[PDB]
Design a protein around this motif. Structure first.
Motif, PDB file in Angstrom:
ATOM      1  N   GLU A   1      21.372  -1.566 -22.401  1.00 52.65           N
ATOM      2  CA  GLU A   1      21.364  -0.138 -22.633  1.00 52.65           C
ATOM      3  C   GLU A   1      19.958   0.058 -23.027  1.00 52.65           C
ATOM      4  OE1 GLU A   1      25.399   0.976 -24.610  1.00 52.65           O
ATOM      5  OE2 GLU A   1      25.277  -1.215 -25.303  1.00 52.65           O
ATOM      6  N   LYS A   2      19.127  -0.778 -23.675  1.00 55.03           N
ATOM      7  CA  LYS A   2      17.888  -0.364 -23.980  1.00 55.03           C
ATOM      8  C   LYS A   2      17.105  -0.055 -22.449  1.00 55.03           C
ATOM      9  CE  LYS A   2      17.730  -3.254 -28.250  1.00 55.03           C
ATOM     10  NZ  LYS A   2      17.096  -2.343 -29.243  1.00 55.03           N
ATOM     11  N   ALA A   3      17.285  -1.000 -21.496  1.00 57.15           N
ATOM     12  CA  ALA A   3      16.362  -0.888 -20.347  1.00 57.15           C
ATOM     13  C   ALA A   3      16.959   0.219 -19.425  1.00 57.15           C
ATOM     14  CB  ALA A   3      16.517  -2.237 -19.672  1.00 57.15           C
ATOM     15  N   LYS A   4      18.332   0.198 -19.356  1.00 54.76           N
ATOM     16  CA  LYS A   4      19.046   1.221 -18.640  1.00 54.76           C
ATOM     17  C   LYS A   4      18.567   2.747 -19.156  1.00 54.76           C
ATOM     18  CE  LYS A   4      23.046   3.173 -20.579  1.00 54.76           C
ATOM     19  NZ  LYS A   4      24.403   2.678 -21.242  1.00 54.76           N
ATOM     20  N   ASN A   5      18.496   2.772 -20.565  1.00 59.66           N
ATOM     21  CA  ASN A   5      18.136   4.193 -20.992  1.00 59.66           C
ATOM     22  C   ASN A   5      16.532   4.241 -20.796  1.00 59.66           C
ATOM     23  OD1 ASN A   5      20.510   5.067 -22.001  1.00 59.66           O
ATOM     24  ND2 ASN A   5      20.497   3.359 -23.949  1.00 59.66           N
ATOM     25  N   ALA A   6      15.732   3.300 -20.580  1.00 56.44           N
ATOM     26  CA  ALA A   6      14.549   3.579 -20.273  1.00 56.44           C
ATOM     27  C   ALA A   6      14.151   3.919 -18.904  1.00 56.44           C
ATOM     28  CB  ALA A   6      13.629   2.138 -20.797  1.00 56.44           C
ATOM     29  N   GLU A   7      15.009   3.294 -18.040  1.00 55.22           N
ATOM     30  CA  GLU A   7      14.735   3.383 -16.657  1.00 55.22           C
ATOM     31  C   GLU A   7      15.233   4.887 -16.134  1.00 55.22           C
ATOM     32  OE1 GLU A   7      15.645   1.556 -12.401  1.00 55.22           O
ATOM     33  OE2 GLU A   7      16.899   0.911 -14.013  1.00 55.22           O
ATOM     34  N   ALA A   8      16.325   5.337 -16.978  1.00 48.82           N
ATOM     35  CA  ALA A   8      16.643   6.632 -16.674  1.00 48.82           C
ATOM     36  C   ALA A   8      15.741   7.925 -17.184  1.00 48.82           C
ATOM     37  CB  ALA A   8      18.162   6.882 -17.549  1.00 48.82           C
TER      38      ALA A   8
END
Ligand SMILES: [Cl-]
Ligand SMILES: [Zn+2]
Ligand SMILES: [Zn+2]
Length: 406
Positions: free
Chosen positions: A122-129
């Motif tokens: 969720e850290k990375a998905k939130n960053a990529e978004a």
């Protein structure tokens, strides 16, 4: 009957795997060299031995620098590489990686995130978004080795790496950073399967004795899971000369440490006929820690509820005189794909009688043969071998599948 389980034999196998070979990361030369060792071991025990090869995700490694500082990293499986020149971009601070924590300023920058609260995914998905070019996650705890930002099976479109607590602290005060990540493709691992089949029974019930033989980076992986592999192997040696109407399959699973990749592959390729014959899976994973506090042997089932493995173990306990045995819930080992398939399974593992947890050395370079208790291998051995004797004589969530995902 005489069941002469020799823990010294096991101990010698832990040494072969964790000292002679060392860390056995899934897909690498040392894992492949360990497979040869185990295959060879099995054949001498007079098992019919096949080696099952399967594909696994691309392997990533590389480098990180900022100002003058070079920073040791662990890349996340299933994430994106950088071009050979690398990615240089400003360091945005996202704190804990909530979608809220991402201002419009994050777009085009490397998101530097602290460990904790959220799943690494969720850290990375939130960053990529939010437009991040890449993701660095630093530990919120002390450590000898950079944390592994486990993305729990997910594929992410940017680079995602993990680094030590201090390095990430020095990072929050820097303007930019340079990341170089290359993806090694066509990676494979393998299961080593050794079968003891009754020569005149047709379509016999199948009993599975299993243990994974890979380990995490930088860990010699003596207890996780050279021990399980070793006990499993010695048990095949004792059970070698015991008559049985059961087909027993001793298996060393590869690439467990990437998300049960070996066992899942294996179970998935069982035919419907074989599934219907499958009776029970005994899985051995961490059955030799010398950590004095870890004296309760836990029998983990994916749903916390009794089954044949449990039933057999409880009985063997009474037979051998052993009071420190407990059923409990637990996933995250190779018993889980069997459970998802309908087959009574359980994972055996030492733990602290009070808090249930495992030694502090687990997944560190200190997971060494030096912290293997020869006594604890014997207890686990004598117990599981008896339980198996009793047997053969005449969907899961990410948190139940993977390890260290936050
Ligand atoms: Cl001895
Ligand atoms: Zn393990
Ligand atoms: Zn592990």
């Amino acid at each position: 009957r005489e069941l002469p389980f020799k823990a010294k034999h096991a101990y010698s196998t832990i040494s072969q795997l964790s000292e002679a070979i060392g860390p056995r990361i899934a897909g690498t030369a040392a894992e492949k060299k360990s497979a040869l060792l185990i295959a060879s071991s099995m054949r001498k025990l007079k098992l019919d031995v096949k080696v099952q090869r399967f594909n696994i995700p691309d392997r990533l490694e590389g480098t990180l620098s900022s100002a003058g500082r070079d920073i040791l990293l662990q890349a996340a499986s299933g994430s994106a590489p950088t071009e050979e020149q690398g990615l240089t971009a400003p360091l945005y601070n996202a704190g804990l990686g909530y979608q809220k924590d991402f201002t419009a300023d994050a777009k085009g920058k490397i998101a530097l995130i602290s460990r904790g609260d959220l799943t690494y995914y969720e850290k990375a998905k939130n960053a990529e978004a939010a437009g991040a070019k890449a993701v660095i996650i630093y530990n919120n705890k002390e450590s000898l080795v950079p944390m592994t930002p486990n993305l729990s099976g997910n594929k992410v479109g940017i680079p995602v790496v993990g680094i030590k607590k201090e390095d990430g602290e020095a990072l929050t005060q820097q303007k930019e950073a340079t990341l170089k990540l290359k993806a090694f493709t066509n990676q494979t691992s393998q299961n080593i399967i050794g079968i003891k089949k009754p020569k005149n029974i047709k379509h016999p019930d199948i009993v599975y004795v299993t243990a994974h033989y890979d380990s995490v980076p930088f860990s010699p992986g003596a207890n996780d899971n050279g021990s399980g592999t070793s006990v499993m192997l010695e048990m095949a040696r004792v059970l070698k000369s015991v008559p049985s109407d059961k087909e027993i399959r001793f298996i060393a699973f590869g690439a467990e440490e990437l998300g049960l990749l070996g066992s899942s592959h294996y179970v998935d390729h069982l035919s419907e006929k074989e599934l219907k014959r499958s009776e029970v899976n005994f899985n051995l994973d961490m059955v030799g820690t010398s950590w004095e506090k870890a004296s309760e042997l836990y029998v983990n089932t994916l749903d916390g509820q009794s089954n044949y493995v449990w039933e057999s173990s409880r009985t063997a306990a009474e037979k051998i005189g052993f009071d420190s045995l407990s059923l409990t819930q637990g996933g995250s080992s190779d018993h889980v794909p069997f459970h998802e398939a309908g087959i009574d399974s359980a994972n055996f593992i030492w733990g602290d009688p009070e808090t249930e947890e495992v030694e502090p050395w687990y997944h560190t370079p200190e997971d060494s043969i030096e912290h293997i208790s020869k006594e604890r291998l014997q207890q686990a051995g004598d117990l599981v071998t008896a339980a198996v004797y009793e047997a053969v004589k005449k969907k899961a969530k990410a948190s139940d599948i993977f390890e260290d995902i936050k």
